[PDB]
Structures are given as structure tokens and as C-alpha cells.
Amino acid sequence: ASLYSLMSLIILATLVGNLIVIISISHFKQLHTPTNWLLHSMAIVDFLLCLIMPCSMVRTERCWYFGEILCKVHTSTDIMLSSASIFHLAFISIDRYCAVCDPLRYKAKINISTILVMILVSWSLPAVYAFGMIFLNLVEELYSQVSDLGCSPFFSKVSGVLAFTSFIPGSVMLFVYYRIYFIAKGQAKAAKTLGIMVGVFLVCWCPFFLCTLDPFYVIPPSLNDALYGYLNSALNPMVYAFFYPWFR
Amino acid sequence: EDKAAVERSKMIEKQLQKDKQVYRRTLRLLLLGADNSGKSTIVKQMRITSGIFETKFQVDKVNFHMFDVGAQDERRKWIQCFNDVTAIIFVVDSNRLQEALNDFKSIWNNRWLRTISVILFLNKQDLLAEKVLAKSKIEDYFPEFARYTTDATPEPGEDPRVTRAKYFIRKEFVDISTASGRHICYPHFTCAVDTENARRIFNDCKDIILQMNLREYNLV
Amino acid sequence: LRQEAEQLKNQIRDARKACADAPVGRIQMRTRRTLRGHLAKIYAMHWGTDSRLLVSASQDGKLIIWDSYTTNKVHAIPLRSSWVMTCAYAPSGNYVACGGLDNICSIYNLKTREGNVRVSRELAGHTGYLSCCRFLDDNQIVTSSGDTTCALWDIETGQQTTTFTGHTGDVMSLSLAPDTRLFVSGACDASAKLWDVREGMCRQTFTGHESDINAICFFPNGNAFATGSDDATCRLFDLRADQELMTYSHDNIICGITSVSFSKSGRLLLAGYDDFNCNVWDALKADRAGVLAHDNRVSCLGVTDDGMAVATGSWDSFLKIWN
Amino acid sequence: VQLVESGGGLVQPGGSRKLSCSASGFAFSSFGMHWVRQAPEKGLEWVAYISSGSGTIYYADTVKGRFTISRDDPKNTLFLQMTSLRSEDTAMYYCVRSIYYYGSSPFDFWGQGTTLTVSADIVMTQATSSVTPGESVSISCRSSKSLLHSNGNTYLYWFLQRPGQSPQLLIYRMSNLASGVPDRFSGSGSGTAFTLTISRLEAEDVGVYYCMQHLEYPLTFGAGTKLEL
Amino acid sequence: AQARKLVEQLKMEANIDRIKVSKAAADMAYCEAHAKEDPLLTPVPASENPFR
Ligand SMILES: [NH3+]C1CCCCC1
């Protein structure tokens, strides 16, 4: 009971929060800037992530009573919708890296036409890759784990390496933020904002993906449960839209 | 019917959007040189009864539009129109230098140019080198000239007494009204004829917009 | 000479102070349309005689003519000079006049056999920046410049018909009369002068404001007008009485006035201020009952000839119509 | 402002012909373009309509799949290509200029035109086709539906095609007369019944007068009253 | 010169007919007789409102 409420607490916070980037922006022309649209689309992404999040609240009844039919679709949706979050964060780092490392051309190569390319790629590649690899995930004998009780996505060396590209955004973010730290520190805070932005991402994503170690399997559902990122998604707007005056 | 009027409005908004992309890229600058200052000289080197004498150039692939002023003796009212320029650009001959300090300070601490940075150009220091060497003493005009001492390295190839006055006027300008945070002076030494004027503007504007971006993202 | 001028000024003051004999409610004017599409700050607008079309000018160098009812953009004119501090719309609707910091007034022919709005005349001859221009007819136009001199031009000839001289500071706005015989114009010398169009000479001078006048309007009656200046005060000056009436100002306002306008009945004096907001007053009592809330300095103001609505412009690139 | 139409000739039935309208003297890129048919022994009829930037196209219900319209703004020209020319598509085709904004005058200018050899819409009719110079004359027109729209416009157009020359515009939206027409033409109506009044009468007013509607998209013309005086 | 023109203008503007302030401020009256035709002072009902 306590675990269910604790986990579920982030769903409503996520839903109420993204309303902000949606309601501050689509009403807005005070904030119609190309940069805003990325936050607008990511708020949509995390909002979707009403389908997954309540379902995973029920999923943790250690059994997927909702039905074996919905299994692959539900899993494909989480990968797609989170790969979507990451990629959005990656492109946000990209646009912030052509605003503090190239500020004369910041607007000429970051604009609504480029932003629509960055949004379509982020909604396409995760979706196509996840649905293609949830209906070719895998070693079914090992899946016995998947086969025994009914559900949670799990992978194997064949596909675990491909699963954990998504974590390319990390290299882009680290390169971008070490350059941004170097420049901002040279100018004269930068340190606090950068540290919190990189840390919020890292602390959530790193352990689950590192364990996803399993193909070389002591990871039980008892302990893999907390590893399943949702709280990071609950927090992304807060870091990326509220700390700076974009809030209004 | 009426729907065709809506189509016309949409097709006009289409052109407005395609012109918004050109209004963002170009960086607007306002030139506010003095009467005797060599601002005409600096705008003459642009290969790189009217009112505004606009001049468009491009350092590398970035387009700057410098708005010079023609037949406009009071500026208390037509200055507020330049609230959206990237930067002001003063030109000063470094006695008429005190008037340059006065109007420089008055441009600072206004109500409409609070968020606009300033690029100083100290044009015609070629005459300043001879003035420092010979007869004309800045002590009479400025009592603190004698007390002031030079340690930022100057450009080699000149006497230590000819590059010691430059820093005096530079310091006087930079502490005229900058030291009251959102905008600060960017002093320079434009001399008489140098081809680095555009680069001194390009790097300056790059720094200005970088600082603006850092302030929006809260990097500072 | 100076002693005589001082004596004349004292006599004038005594004569205009000789006699001194002597609630609308919350308007809550709600925005109905929002004419978005301008890429830079709005400087000036002008309504139409039909009360349907309006024209606005932007720092981009764009003069956009909007259909207020249906929000459509009837016309989009690219200006030669990006810096435009005033615009006009002809009473017949065939012409628009834009004037700004280029010291040249451009008259564009809206109704032409071609499908482009071309400039019919480039009236040059002023020295200072143009700050207000208004049409008398399709033939003659009165312009306000920053060189302390107003002017009256004949468009087809392209030359000044008369020059109105006498101001000390740069003249910021002018307002016509319903009869179009006399016109008032305020300047930076903290004075507003009534001029006679026919004789090309100053008729009266009104003082009392502390700072430079940045906007002037004229009462529909024909014998009164109102001014807006940078000292956050508006004043109603009688024209035929040469006096100062009740002053519309508040202790909570520290920013000056950028534009002024009247309602057709004259019961409402609308004032576009600098603090991102346009205020209203009961012109017969000077009570602020209603506020027209933009995101930047409200720079322009207009009221339709039938009083249907009031349009407000501001430096947030937006132009809002309120009823 | 002048439009030169090109095409025409002796064409066997079932063929294909691409007629052109070269516009010069105005901003063709900003003016919607219509085509209007006129049989040798009948009144006018609408063919097709293309918007200013070709963002919207309408075709006549009589022939819709065989006709195609196009415009070239950089060259300021218009094209109408017809295929499988039946025995009815052998009439006089006029390319018409028409811009649409508040206060505008659609159908203001009509081209020279070229010859050719081989339902639920509002129908506009006239009392007759015939009516001495020097006294006022009146022409009556009727519509199958109220042409007065909710906004207030009454989409009725009068043209007065004079013999030996292309048609022009007298009065647009019922009430507002054209620019170059003499100030002796007036129009009034209630929504379905219309009347056009001419005070004087000269050697130029002789001709056939047409009655067009623009409320609904199909543009049905009238019959034409031939005033001989 | 410049002083003479100002003196002449002041003399011309000094001889101007003026009336009592109470009479000049009573035409308020223009507002009274023209108030009913003001859509702004008196709100237009939502049947003839042009910007409804
Ligand atoms: N829970 C999911 C997070 C992203 C990678 C696949 C597993």
C-alpha cells in the first residue's frame, strides 16, 4: 500500500506540471520562441508517459493482471516515450549549446523549421525502434523469467547493448555541459545550475541502465522495481522550464 | 467570398513570417559619435537633409546594420527609438573631450537604454600621441592626470609616455557612469585608420549576445 | 525687447487667469481582437473613416493595414526607412501617410489600378524627425517634425504650402479639428500651440505642463483639446478660452504619456502610458475608472469615428482592439 | 492594367487546348483569377477560379474534371487547359481579375477574351432581354436565393457588356459602383429581387447587361438585357 | 531678429477674445447631448456589437 502511493505520487505531479509548458506556451506568443516548442513537445511526451505511469503503478500486485495481450504494446510505449524524453533533453542541450557557444547565429540555426525536425526525429526514431523491437526483443528460455508469472521488459546481450544509443544523449550532454561550464566560469551561478541539470539526469538514469549487467542476472523484480526514471520525467520540466524565468 | 480575404490575410502573414527570420538574424547597432569625432571615418571604412544614415555590412556571415544620425542638436527624444539595438557605438577624440564624457554619461543611466551595452571607440589617438608628447597638458583639464599612473601591457612600438595617456582617458570613460550590471562599457582604441574596426564590433557583439544568453539561461 | 516680452507674457497670464469662475464607472473594456503579425515595436496607428480598417507602423519598417472586424491583413507595405514614429490614414481612405526619423513623409496610394500599395509622394524638406502627420484632404497634409516647426504641404506639388514656426523644442504630435481650419500641436518646450491652417501662423499658445509633450489629442467639440507629456500628467486645455482645466493625473503613476485619444461623446479620455498599460478617464471630471491592460510600453492609441471600439498598440509587437 | 488572352482556333471535338492569359500592368501575384464563358447566342457563365497564390481552386459544375487552371506569378501569367472539348465548350472565354479584401471591387477588370471552335446552385434570371436616349431606364433581375449575407454584403454584380468590346463592371456588391464608370448607374434590391437604374443614356450605354451572383462559390450569371436606344 | 518675432507673436496672441471659464467649461454639454451615440461610454448590446 505504501509503495503504491509513493510511486503513484509522481504521476499526478507530472500531469499537473506539464500542463504548465502547454498552457504557458500554446496560449503564449509571449513565449512562442523556437526554443519554447521543444519544452512544449517534451511536456506532451511526459504527459503521455497518463498511459504508462498509472499502469505501472498497478503493475507494482506483483503480477500483470491487466492482460498478456497488452504486454508488448505497454512495454513499447515506455521505451518509446522515454527514449523520447531523453532525446528531447539531448536536443535541448543542443539548442542551449548554440546559444552559449554560438550566440550570433543562435537564431539562424535554431528556429521553428529546425525545431520541427528535432521533434519529428524524437517522436519517430524511438517509436519505430521500440515497436520494431518489442513485437524483435529476443533467449526465450531465459524469458524461465518472463514466461513464468507474467510482463516487465527485460532484454539480453543481443538487444541490451542496443537498448542502453539511448543513454549518445549522455555523451552529447556531457560534452555540451563541460564546454558550457568552461566558458561560463571563464567569463567571470553556472556551476549550480549545470550541476543540478546533469545530476538530475544521471542519478536516475545511470543505475537502471547499468544493471540492464544482467546478461553477464541476479537482478530480481524485488530490487529492479525502483530502477524503473519515472521520477526523473516527473522532474524534467521543473529543471528545464521553471528554474529560469521561462516559468511565466 | 469572404474566405478569399482570409486567404489573402494568411498569405500576407506568410510573408510576415519570412521577414521575421531576417529581422532576427540581423544585429542592429546605433552609432552616437560626437560632432568632431571621427565617426564619419569609421563608417567610411565599411567595405568588410536626410535622417538616419543606415549602413549594412557583414563581419563573416553575420549581418550588422549600423544606424548613423544625420540632421536630427537634441537627442532626448529620438534615442528611445533605439531600445531594440544590439549596442551603442560611441566615437571620441581624446578641450572638447569633457563634452564627450558628459554626453557619454548622460546616455548611460537612461530609462530606455538600460539593457543596451556600449562599445567605445577612441578614434584619432594619432593626434593624442603628439598631444601627450607636446605643450598641451591634460593636467589643466583633468587634475588627476599627474597623479594617475599606468599594469596592462600596451601595444609595443610606442613611447611609454604616449601609451600612458591612452589608459587615462580609457579609465575615465569606463568609470564615468558604468560603475553605478546588465550592460557595461567595451573600451577600444580606434586610432585613425585601422582595418580591425569590424572585428572589434563582431567579437564585441558576440560577447554581448553570449552574456544575454547566459542571463536568460541563468548561467551567471 | 526682453522686458516687453516679459510684460506681454505677464499680461497674457493675467488675462487668462482673470475670471477663473470654475461618474462613468469601471469601463472594463474587454479585448475582442488581437492583430498579431508585426515583427517589431509598434510606434503609431490610425483608424479609418469607415471604422473598419486601421493602419499600424512598426520599427521593422512595416505599415500593416488590418480589417478590424475580421482581423484580416488588408495590406502590408514595406517602408524605405525602418524608423517610423507616426502613420496616418486618409479621411477618404485612398492614402496613408507614414513619417518617422528619416525626416521624410511618405504618402502611399491605397486605391490604385495596380495590386500594390505604391508611394504617391515623398514629402521632404523637414530637418528634424517626423513625429505626427495627419491628413486634411487628399490634397493637403499637415506634418509635425522634430525641428521645432510644423508644416502644411500640398501633395501633388510636393512642396511646403505653409511653415508653422515658433516652437522651442521638438514637436511631438498634432491634432486636427472636425472643421479642419485650426489644428493644435504639442512640443518638447512643454507647450502646445494652436495654429491656423489658412494663414500659416500661430493662433494661441498653451503652457502649464512640467515636461515635454509627447502626445496631443483634440476634443470633438472643436473648442477644447488634451495633452499628454512625460511628467505623467494629462491636461485639458480649452481652445477658445485659453485656459487650463482639470488635470488627469495620479500619484501612483510615475511614467509619462505616450498617446492620447478621446471617445466620440468626449466623456472618455483614453491615455496610453509607458507602464505597459493604457488608462481611461472621465474627461469632464478626470477620474481613472478602468484600465486597458500589453507586455510593453503602450505607444499608440486610436478610437473609431463611430466610437465602436478603441485600438491600443505597444512595443510588444501587438495591437489590441477593445470594446 | 491589361490582359491579353491567347489561344483559340479550329479544334476537333474531343481534343485538348491550353489557353493563356498574359497579364501586365498590375500586381498579378496579388489578384485572384477567374474564367468566364459566354456562348455566342447566350449570356455569360463561370468556368473556374484560382486564388492569389493558387491556394484555393474552384471549378464549374458543368465541366470539372476536364478543365484545369494554373498561374505563374514570376511570369505574371495564367493558364486554362481543357481536354475532351465537347460541343458546348466552343464559346468566348474571358480571364477576369478579382481581388478580395474589405472595400475591394472583385471582377473589376475583364480581359479581351479568345474564341473557340468545335443543380442546387443559385440561379439568376431576368424579366426579358429588351427595354430612346435621354430618360432613365431600369433593369430587373431575380435570384433563386437571398444573396444578402449575414455580414451585410449583397453579392450582386452588374457588367453591361457593350457590343464589339469586352465586358466591364458597373456596380459590385449591388450597391457600390465601379471607379471609372459615370456616376449615373445605381443599384438596389431586397435580397432576391434586384433593379439597376440608369439616369441618362448615351452611345456607350447601349449593349447587353448582365447579372452575376457571388454568394455561393458556383458563379451563375443572368440572361442579359439588350438595351437598344 | 529672434526677439522681435517673439514679441510680435506675443502681442498678436495677447489680443484674443476670451470668455468666462464657467461658460467655456459648460459645453460637458457636448457630452450630455452626444452620450447616447457612444458605444464606449454606453456599452453596445450583443445584437449590434460589431466586435462581438
Ligand atoms: N524502463 C525502460 C527505460 C528506457 C530503456 C528501456 C527500459
Domain ranges of chain C: 1-322
Instruction: Confirm if C128 and C112 have CB atoms less than 8 A apart.
Output: no
Q: Ligand 1 pocket check: which of A56, A78, A131, A227 to mutate, most ligand atoms within 8 Å of Cβ?
A: A78
Q: Assess if residue B9 is contained within a domain.
A: no
Ligand 1 pocket member A229 (CB < 6 A): yes
Please tell me whether residues D181 and D135 are part of one structural domain. Answer: yes
Please tell me whether residues D48 and D88 are part of one structural domain. Answer: yes
Could you give the C-alpha distances from A31 to A246, B54, B192, C6, C317, in angstroms and in order?
8, 31, 45, 57, 13
> Ligand 1 centre and the CA of A112: distance in Å?
30
Torsion of CA D123, D127, D128, D130, to 10 degrees: -120
Q: Are strands C31-35 and C319-322 parallel, antiparallel or unpaired?
A: antiparallel
- Asked whether the beta carbons of residue D27 and residue C74 sit closer than 8 angstroms, the reply is no
Report the first-to-last Cα separation within chain D, whole angstroms: 31
| Sequence-ordered list of residues with C-beta below 8 angstroms from that of D56, at least 6 positions apart, any chain | B3, B4, B7, D50
> Ligand 1 centre and the CA of A150: distance in Å?
18
Residue A229 to residue C69: CA distance in whole angstroms = 51
Superfamily in which the C1-322 domain is placed by CATH: YVTN repeat-like/Quinoprotein amine dehydrogenase (2.130.10.10)
What one-character-per-residue DSSP string does chain B give?
Answer: -HHHHHHHHHHHHHHHHHHHHHHHHSEEEEE---SSSTHHHHHH------SEEEEEEEETTEEEEEEEE------TTTSGGGTT-SEEEEEEE---HHHHHHHHHHHTT-SSSSS-EEEEEEE-HHHHHHHHH----HHHH-GGGTT--------SSS-TTTSHHHHHHHHHHHTTSS------EE----BSS-TTHHHHHHHHHHHHHHHHHHHHHT--
Long-range contacts of D132-136 (CB under 8 A, 24+ apart): D132/D201, D132/D229, D133/D200, D133/D201, D133/D202, D133/D203, D133/D205, D133/D229, D134/D200, D134/D201, D135/D201, D136/D197, D136/D198, D136/D199, D136/D200
Q: Which residue has the cell 462613468?
A: C24
Q: What is the SS3 assignment for C15?
A: helix
> Ligand 1 centre and the CA of A233: distance in Å?
12
D27 touches chain C (CB under 8 A): yes
Q: Assess if residue B2 is contained within a domain.
A: no
Q: Ligand 1 pocket check: which of A208, A210, A213, A214 to mutate, most ligand atoms within 8 Å of Cβ?
A: A208
- Residues after which a C–N gap over 2.5 Å breaks chain C: 22, 293
Cβ–Cβ pairs < 8 A, chains C and D: 33
What one-character-per-residue DSSP string does A42-82 give?
Answer: HHHHHHH---HHHHHHHH---S-TT-GGGHHHHHHHHHHHH
| Sequence-ordered list of residues with C-beta below 8 angstroms from that of D206, at least 6 positions apart, any chain | D162, D163, D227, D228, D229
| Sequence-ordered list of residues with C-beta below 8 angstroms from that of D79, at least 6 positions apart, any chain | D18, D19, D20, D21, D69, D70, D71, D72
Closest Cα partner for D185 from D163, D157, D154, D143? D157
Residue D78 to residue D34: CA distance in whole angstroms = 10
The Cα of C17 is separated from the nearest Cα of chain B by a number of Å equal to 32
Chain E residue with Cα closest to C282: E41
Closest Cα partner for C257 from C277, C240, C237? C277
Closest Cα partner for B43 from B175, B146, B197, B172? B197
Could you give the C-alpha distances from D219 to A214, D28, D87, in angstroms and in order?
73, 22, 21
Instruction: Confirm if D99 and D53 have CB atoms less than 8 A apart.
Output: no
**In this structure, what are the phi and psi dihedrals at residue C259, rounded to the nearest 5 degrees?**
-150, 155
Q: What is the DSSP letter of D40?
A: T
Q: Are strands C268-273 and C257-262 parallel, antiparallel or unpaired?
A: antiparallel
Q: Assess if residue B16 is contained within a domain.
A: no
Per 3-state DSSP, what percentage of chain C is helix, strand, and coil (rounded to 5)? 5, 50, 45
Q: Residue B143, exposed/middle/buried by CB under 10 A (0-12, 13-18, 19+)?
A: exposed
Half-sphere exposure of E26 (CA within 13 A, CB side): 6
Chain C residue with Cα closest to D109: C113
- Asked whether the beta carbons of residue B213 and residue A99 sit closer than 8 angstroms, the reply is yes
Name the residue among D101, D149, D155 with its Cβ closest to that of B5. Answer: D101
Residue A179 to residue A185: CA distance in whole angstroms = 10
Residue C91 to residue C50: CA distance in whole angstroms = 9
- Asked whether the beta carbons of residue E27 and residue C223 sit closer than 8 angstroms, the reply is yes
Ligand 1 pocket member A82 (CB < 6 A): yes
Map out the domains of chain E with their CATH numbers.
Answer: 1-51 (4.10.260.10)
Residue type, D93: Y
Q: Assess if residue B19 is contained within a domain.
A: no
Q: Which residue has the cell 564619419?
A: B40
Residue type, B112: W
Q: Which domain holds residue D147?
A: 121-223
Name the residue among B2, B3, B7 with its Cβ closest to that of D52. Answer: B7
Q: What is the CATH number of domain A2-247?
A: 1.20.1070.10
What residues of A are in the B interface, CB distance below 8 Å? 96, 99-100, 103-108, 111, 180, 183-184, 187-190, 193-194, 243-245
- Asked whether the beta carbons of residue B19 and residue C103 sit closer than 8 angstroms, the reply is no
Please tell me whether residues D106 and D146 are part of one structural domain. Answer: no
Give me the number of domains chain B comprises. Answer: 1
> Ligand 1 centre and the CA of A128: distance in Å?
15
> CA quadruple A114, A115, A118, A121: dihedral positive or negative?
negative
Residue C82 to residue C54: CA distance in whole angstroms = 20
Q: What is the SS3 assignment for D18?
A: strand
Residue type, B13: E
- Asked whether the beta carbons of residue D26 and residue C115 sit closer than 8 angstroms, the reply is yes
The Cα of D53 is separated from the nearest Cα of chain B by a number of Å equal to 8
B77 touches chain D (CB under 8 A): no
Closest Cα partner for C101 from A16, B70, E5? B70
- Asked whether the beta carbons of residue E31 and residue C284 sit closer than 8 angstroms, the reply is yes
Q: Are strands C118-124 and B52-59 parallel, antiparallel or unpaired?
A: unpaired
B18 touches chain A (CB under 8 A): no
Please tell me whether residues D79 and D125 are part of one structural domain. Answer: no
Rg of chain D over CA atoms, in angstroms?
17
Output the nine-digit C-alpha cell for D197.
437604374
Q: Assess if residue D229 is contained within a domain.
A: no
Q: What is the DSSP letter of C274?
A: S
Residue C142 to residue C163: CA distance in whole angstroms = 10
Q: Assess if residue D82 is contained within a domain.
A: yes
Domain limits, chain A:
2-247
Chains A and D touch (3+ CB pairs under 8 A): no
| Sequence-ordered list of residues with C-beta below 8 angstroms from that of B150, at least 6 positions apart, any chain | B160, B163, B164, B167
Closest Cα partner for C232 from C263, C217, C210? C210
Ligand 1 pocket member A143 (CB < 6 A): no
- Asked whether the beta carbons of residue B209 and residue A106 sit closer than 8 angstroms, the reply is yes
Name the residue among B6, B20, B51 with its Cβ closest to that of C101. Answer: B51
Chain D residue with Cα closest to B3: D100
Q: What angle do CA B152, B156, B162 make, to 5 degrees?
A: 75
DSSP E strand boundaries for C90-223: 95-100, 104-109, 118-124, 130-135, 140-145, 149-154, 159-165, 171-175, 182-187, 191-196, 201-207, 213-218
Residue B105 to residue C69: CA distance in whole angstroms = 48
The Cα of D27 is separated from the nearest Cα of chain C by a number of Å equal to 5
Could you give the C-alpha distances from D118 to A131, D11, D85, D88, in angstroms and in order?
60, 5, 7, 8
Q: Are strands B27-31 and B87-93 parallel, antiparallel or unpaired?
A: parallel
Using the 3D structure, point to which of D118, D142, D176 is the last residue of a domain.
Answer: D118
Half-sphere exposure of D20 (CA within 13 A, CB side): 8
Closest Cα partner for B83 from A219, D156, C19, C296? C296
Residue C109 to residue C130: CA distance in whole angstroms = 20
Partners of A99 on chain B (C-beta within 8 Å) are 213, 217
Total Cβ atoms within 10 A of residue B148: 16
In CATH, what number is assigned to the domain containing residue B204?
3.40.50.300
Q: Assess if residue D228 is contained within a domain.
A: no
Chains E and B touch (3+ CB pairs under 8 A): no
Name the residue among A99, A188, A193 with its Cβ closest to that of B218. Answer: A193
C200 touches chain E (CB under 8 A): no
- Residues after which a C–N gap over 2.5 Å breaks chain A: 49, 60, 135, 138, 143, 150, 164, 167, 188, 212, 216, 228
Output the nine-digit C-alpha cell for B15.
510573408
Residue type, E23: K
> Ligand 1 centre and the CA of A80: distance in Å?
9
Name the residue among A104, A111, A184 with its Cβ closest to that of B219. Answer: A184
C36 touches chain A (CB under 8 A): yes
Give me the number of domains chain D comprises. Answer: 2
- Asked whether the beta carbons of residue E30 and residue C11 sit closer than 8 angstroms, the reply is no
Closest Cα partner for C317 from D25, B36, A32? A32
Q: Assess if residue B107 is contained within a domain.
A: yes
Please tell me whether residues D63 and D143 are part of one structural domain. Answer: no
Experimental technique, in short, is: cryo-EM
Nearest CA owner, ligand 1 atom 3 = A79
Output the nine-digit C-alpha cell for D143.
435570384
- Asked whether the beta carbons of residue D55 and residue B4 sit closer than 8 angstroms, the reply is no
Residue D91 to residue D115: CA distance in whole angstroms = 6
Q: What is the SS3 assignment for C140?
A: strand
- Asked whether the beta carbons of residue C36 and residue A29 sit closer than 8 angstroms, the reply is yes
Residue A100 to residue A186: CA distance in whole angstroms = 13
Torsion of CA C140, C145, C148, C153, to 10 degrees: -20
Q: Which residue has the cell 450582386?
A: D156
Residue B38 to residue B220: CA distance in whole angstroms = 36
A29 touches chain C (CB under 8 A): yes
Chain C residue with Cα closest to D97: C115
Q: Residue C311, exposed/middle/buried by CB under 10 A (0-12, 13-18, 19+)?
A: buried
Q: Assess if residue B7 is contained within a domain.
A: no
Entry resolution (Å): 3.1
B114 touches chain C (CB under 8 A): no
Residues flagged as binding site of A:
78
**In this structure, what are the phi and psi dihedrals at residue B64, rounded to the nearest 5 degrees?**
-110, 140
Using the 3D structure, point to which of D84, D118, D152 is the last residue of a domain.
Answer: D118
What one-character-per-residue DSSP string does chain A give?
Answer: -HHHHHHHHHHHHHHHHHHHHHHHHHS-STT-SHHHHHHHHHHHHHHH---HHHHHHHH---S-TT-GGGHHHHHHHHHHHHHHHHHHHHHHHHHHTTTSS--SSTTTTSSHHHHHHHHHHHHHHHHHHHHHTT-----TTT---HHHH-------HHHHHHH-----HHHHHHHHHHHHHHHHHHH--HHHHHHHHHHHHHHHHHHHHHH--TT-----HHHHTTT--HHHHHHHHIIIIISSGGG-
B12 touches chain D (CB under 8 A): no
> Ligand 1 centre and the CA of A78: distance in Å?
7
Residue D47 to residue D69: CA distance in whole angstroms = 10
D156-180 core/surface letters (b: 16 or more CB in 10 A; e: else): bbbbbbbeeebbbbbbbbbeebbee
What one-character-per-residue DSSP string does C82-128 give?
Answer: S-EEEEEE-TTSSEEEEEETTSEEEEEESS-SSSS-EEEEEEE---S
| Sequence-ordered list of residues with C-beta below 8 angstroms from that of C120, at least 6 positions apart, any chain | C95, C107, C108, C109, C155
Output the nine-digit C-alpha cell for A151.
510482463
Chain B residue with Cα closest to A242: B217
